[PDB]
Amino acid sequence: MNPKRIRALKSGKQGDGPVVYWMSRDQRAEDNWALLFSRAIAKEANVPVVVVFCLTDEFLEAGIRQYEFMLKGLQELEVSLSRKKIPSFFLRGDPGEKISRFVKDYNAGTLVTDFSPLRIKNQWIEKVISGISIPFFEVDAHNVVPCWEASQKHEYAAHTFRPKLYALLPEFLEEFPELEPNSVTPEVETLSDVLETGVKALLPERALLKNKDPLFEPWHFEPGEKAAKKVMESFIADRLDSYGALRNDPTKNMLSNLSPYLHFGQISSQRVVLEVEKAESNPGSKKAFLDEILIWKEISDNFCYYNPGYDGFESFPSWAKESLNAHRNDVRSHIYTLEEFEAGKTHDPLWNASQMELLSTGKMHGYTRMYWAKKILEWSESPEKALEIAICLNDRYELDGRDPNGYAGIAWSIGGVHDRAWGEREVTGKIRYMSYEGCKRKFDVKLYIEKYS
Ligand SMILES: Cc1cc2nc3c(=O)[nH]c(=O)nc-3n(C[C@H](O)[C@H](O)[C@H](O)COP(=O)(O)OP(=O)(O)OC[C@H]3O[C@@H](n4cnc5c(N)ncnc54)[C@H](O)[C@@H]3O)c2cc1C
């Protein structure tokens, strides 16, 4: 077990009660460094390990599509942890109040959590630190190389982060040890009731078309750790050979479709990398997939960890801020409101089709995301307004939303983060421009519009 994966958040006197794993980002029982580190310390202190998940008050800022995907995976995880003699406690409310009260009520000895560089997680860390007196650790279980170890600063381009991450791969890309069960079973409601009351509270804000029927189709991605692995096996067996060639064709389903499982932590990226590396296929297709799940996935965590305002105009590069400012007064061709974007009521049928895939499936194709976001910038009153519209529609309807990949992806599309300066245009400046005719020369746009009416 590598000590560079765990970080100390607060020193304190260890209690003689169970080590608590405050699970948040990585919702799985297998291939979880944070859960394995909790079981090791619990073994050394000769005391069982317990798992606590907090159902926050912010679930109403999303939709039913994310509430059911996360909770149905939690029902499966509870059985898996119980088979390992590990009990799960699901609290509801502010984790600054619930975790602090649980630690004192159960005589907790050590508190451990998983790593997330998002602002809402740092808000929870500051609240729980002020209300505990036991040691508090955090473990990077989402990235192969720990986020604080891959780079000590913000990396402005992928060609700089790539050699730093690959040079550390032999040290941090390793097999997972088996989760040892609790020796004996130790000493706050049913998730089915929590999922019933939450969905009832989310029903008025459900996405519907004119016929009152729902828009979201929940049969595209079954949630759970078991379904997460089955999707990864299908990608390696059927789709990985053609990934490098058909990853930029929205009309082909050649992607791995692992993002909803990777967001909620139902499958480990290090596990996906291990199976892909030991699989035999096209080396151009392998290189392309590892570049997405290693370089671009972990540079998104690097962008959120080293830029406090990762969701603001101030985190853009200087060349992009100066360029967008010099075109702030350019007469926009069109200006749509948030409601026109949300309903896909723009003049562009390709953009509207890209939005309908987002509304109906909760997972828009990877290529159309850059078109969907860069057109928001072209048809917004300001770069800041486009940032708010893109983040709102991304986090509300993407099953992988509210994720560092989404903020770094939106920053790349609108602010040129991890990009370079292109030909100067009006309105958009030097930001990389993607036209409607450029998509037609790349893939059958008519087949993609006809699919998402
Ligand atoms: C405007 C915009 C919005 C995005 N919104 C999200 C989002 O809300 N949530 C999210 O997790 N990703 C987002 N992405 C990144 C990317 O689109 C998705 O990761 C990818 O489409 C997920 O589907 P997939 O797993 O089938 O793709 P694959 O090609 O099979 O890639 C597999 C994994 O590699 C990672 N990956 C792939 N592409 C990217 C990328 N461009 N940036 C970062 N990581 C990547 C992802 O973890 C992905 O799950 C966004 C990108 C853009 C440009």
Q: How would you portray this structure in words?
A:
β5 (110-114), α4 (119-129) and β6 form a beta-alpha-beta unit. α18 runs antiparallel to α19. With 453 residues, the protein is α/β, with parallel strands linked by helices. It has 21 helices and six strands. It has three domains: 1-141, no CATH class; 142-312, no CATH class; 313-453, no CATH class. A six-stranded mixed beta sheet has the order 1-6-5-2-3-4. 43% of the residues are buried. It has helices at residues 33-44, 64-83, 95-105, 119-129, 147-150, 158-167, 169-172, 191-202, 225-239, 243-246, 259-264, 269-277, 283-305, 318-326, 338-342, 349-361, 366-378, 383-397, 404-415, 436-440, 445-451, and strands at residues 6-10, 19-23, 49-55, 88-92, 110-114, 136-139. GO terms for molecular function: deoxyribodipyrimidine photo-lyase activity; DNA binding; nucleotide binding. Residues 17-147 form the Photolyase/cryptochrome alpha/beta domain.
Q: What is shown here, in short?
A:
The chain has 453 residues and is of the alpha/beta class.
Layout of secondary structure:
Elements: E1 6-10, E2 19-23, H1 33-44, E3 49-55, H2 64-83, E4 88-92, H3 95-105, E5 110-114, H4 119-129, E6 136-139, H5 147-150, H6 158-167, H7 169-172, H8 191-202, H9 225-239, H10 243-246, H11 259-264, H12 269-277, H13 283-305, H14 318-326, H15 338-342, H16 349-361, H17 366-378, H18 383-397, H19 404-415, H20 436-440, H21 445-451
Parallel strand pairs: 2-3, 2-5, 3-4, 5-6
Antiparallel strand pairs: 1-6
The structure holds flavin-adenine dinucleotide (FAD).
Flavin-adenine dinucleotide binds next to helix 11, helix 13, helix 17 and helix 19.
PDB class: flavoprotein
Keywords: photoreduction, time-resolved serial crystallography.
Assembly: monomeric
